[PDB]
Amino acid sequence: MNIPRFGVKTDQEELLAQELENLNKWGLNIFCVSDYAGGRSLTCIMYMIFQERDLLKKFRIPVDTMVTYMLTLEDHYHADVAYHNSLHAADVLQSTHVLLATPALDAVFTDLEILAALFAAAIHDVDHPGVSNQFLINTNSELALMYNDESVLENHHLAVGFKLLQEDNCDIFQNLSKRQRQSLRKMVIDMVLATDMSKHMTLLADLKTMVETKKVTSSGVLLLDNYSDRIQVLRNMVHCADLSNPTKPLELYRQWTDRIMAEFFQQGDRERERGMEISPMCDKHTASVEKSQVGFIDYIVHPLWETWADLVHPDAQEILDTLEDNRDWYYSAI
Numbered sequence: 033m034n035i036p037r038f039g040v041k042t043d044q045e046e047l048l049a050q051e052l053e054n055l056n057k058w059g060l061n062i063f064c065v066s067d068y069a070g071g072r073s074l075t076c077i078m079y080m081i082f083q084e085r086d087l088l089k090k091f092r093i094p095v096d097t098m099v100t101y102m103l104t105l106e107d108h109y110h111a112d113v114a115y116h117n118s119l120h121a122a123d124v125l126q127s128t129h130v131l132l133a134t135p136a137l138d139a140v141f142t143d144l145e146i147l148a149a150l151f152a153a154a155i156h157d158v159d160h161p162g163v164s165n166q167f168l169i170n171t172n173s174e175l176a177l178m179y180n181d182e183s184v185l186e187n188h189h190l191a192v193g194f195k196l197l198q199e200d201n202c203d204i205f206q207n208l209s210k211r212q213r214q215s216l217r218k219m220v221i222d223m224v225l226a227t228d229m230s231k232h233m234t235l236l237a238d239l240k241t242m243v244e245t246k247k248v249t250s251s252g253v254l255l256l257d258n259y260s261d262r263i264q265v266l267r268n269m270v271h272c273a274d275l276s277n278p279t280k281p282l283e284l285y286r287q288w289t290d291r292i293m294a295e296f297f298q299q300g301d302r303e304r305e306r307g308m309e310i311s312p313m314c315d316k317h318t319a320s321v322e323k324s325q326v327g328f329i330d331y332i333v334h335p336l337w338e339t340w341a342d343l344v345h346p347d348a349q350e351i352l353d354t355l356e357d358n359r360d361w362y363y364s365a366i
């Protein structure tokens with residue numbers, strides 16, 4: 033291919049150039065990006081980010097190969113799924129891109145660790161069917177049997193993300209050294225596996241413990257002396273970016289909330305048809321969208337982002353406020 037300016041073919045190039053000025057900002061509107069990029073946000077944003085960080089040249093990644101992988105990856109997100117489609121992936125990627133550039137983490141991560149995090153973010157939900165792990169377990173699916181009921185979807189996301197590199201002209205890591213490929217794989221595994229919600233408690237516990245014994249340079253920049261600490265920060269970062277929806281401008285968060293409930297209810301419908309015990313928040317006949325988000329933010333999202341903010345202080349101060357404003361907004365919408 034000839035490679036379009038912003039990676040994708042668009043009829044609204046300038047309206048798109050407008051939004052991409054927010055590429056490095058929390059305030060980026062990915063819904064607009066999707067609209068202006070013919071529904072290919074993940075391909076667009078990943079291309080932009082990779083140019084922005086000079087990652088194509090750094091790792092000697094042919095552009096045509098990069099674009100072919102990204103389109104392939106995007107195609108394996110399900111368009112009929114309400115929330116867990118390529119838009120969610122583009123969102124999580126871009127948030128991750130911002131969280132990497134946060135001042136308190138300046139010159140901490142290697143280029144490889146950066147590359148891994150962005151690759152993990154992009155693939156973390158590929159080929160999601162629109163139902164939870166427990167649904168795949170209860171139905172005795174092939175997937176749940178392969179992976180022994182443990183992080184089924186997440187394991188599936190890793191398998192699919194990596195196997196796609198083998199489709200014609202998709203090997204974006206072809207010029208990486210063996211050592212680097214080995215190392216990237218590990219990091220990506222750890223990060224994607226950390227997006228299983230049942231890992232959240234331990235993840236946050238470790239992050240909290242990290243925060244209490246943190247050491248800083250003269251500048252305010254965090255000092256992560258060794259590898260083990262860094263991947264712990266990377267795991268939490270992608271996890272944060274994954275649950276970053278309620279930290280965004282209210283206009284966006286509400287649209288995310290609508291997408292997730294549609295997905296949730298659609299599972300519930302299917303659970304009902306099959307006479308299965310309905311999963312939490314999936315019963316359209318008894319679910320309070322507004323209560324659920326307040327519980328979610330109170331028990332999961334605030335504790336998570338608070339701890340992250342302590343770690344990167346004071347870089348996340350505005351993000352934390354926005355979460356608290358959004359919490360309040362949903363509290364009063366009951």
Ligand SMILES: CC(=O)CCCCn1c(=O)c2c(ncn2C)n(C)c1=O
Nearest residue numbers: 229275277278288289292324325328
């Ligand atoms: C709007 C948004 O952030 C959806 C992505 C998170 C999905 N999600 C949950 O995972 C969840 C939840 N409550 C408990 N849990 C474990 N809610 C409300 C939720 O949306």
Ligand SMILES: [Mg+2]
Nearest residue numbers: 156157227228
């Ligand atoms: Mg996931």
Ligand SMILES: [Zn+2]
Nearest residue numbers: 156157227274
């Ligand atoms: Zn996700």
